[PDB]
Design a binder for this molecule. Structure first.
Ligand SMILES: [Cl-]
Length: 101
C-alpha cells in the first residue's frame, strides 16, 4: 500500500535521504522508514538548501501528524494536506523525490 506512492521510499538513512534531496528544488520531499526499523517514519523535506527531518507522530486514536494541530487518519491524507498548505512545516510537500531504489 504505502510503496505505491512516489513519495514513500521505504527504509532510507538520514545521510542517504539528504543525498537524494541534495540537488532538488524547494518542496522536494520523501517519506522514509528508518534504515533498520519500519516503525520509525520521517518526512525529509528540502527547503532553502537544507533537509529538515520531521518525525511522524501517532495519536491514541490512530491518526498521524507532523504538526500537532493537523492530524489525519492516514499518511496519504497527511501528505496530501501538507502538499498545499505548509501548516507548520517550513514549506509544502510539493515534489516527491525520484526513487533511487
Ligand atoms: Cl532536522
Amino acid at each position: 500500500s504505502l510503496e505505491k506512492h512516489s513519495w514513500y521510499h521505504g527504509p532510507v538513512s538520514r545521510s542517504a535521504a539528504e543525498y537524494l534531496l541534495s540537488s532538488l528544488i524547494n518542496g522536494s520531499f520523501l517519506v522514509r522508514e528508518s534504515e533498520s526499523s519500519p516503525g520509525q517514519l520521517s518526512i525529509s523535506l528540502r527547503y532553502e538548501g537544507r533537509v529538515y527531518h520531521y518525525r511522524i507522530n501517532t495519536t491514541a486514536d490512530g491518526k498521524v501528524y507532523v504538526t500537532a494541530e493537523s492530524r489525519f487518519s492516514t499518511l496519504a491524507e497527511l501528505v496530501h494536506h501538507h502538499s498545499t498548505v505548509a501548516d507548520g512545516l517550513v514549506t509544502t510537500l510539493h515534489y516527491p523525490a525520484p526513487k533511487c531504489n
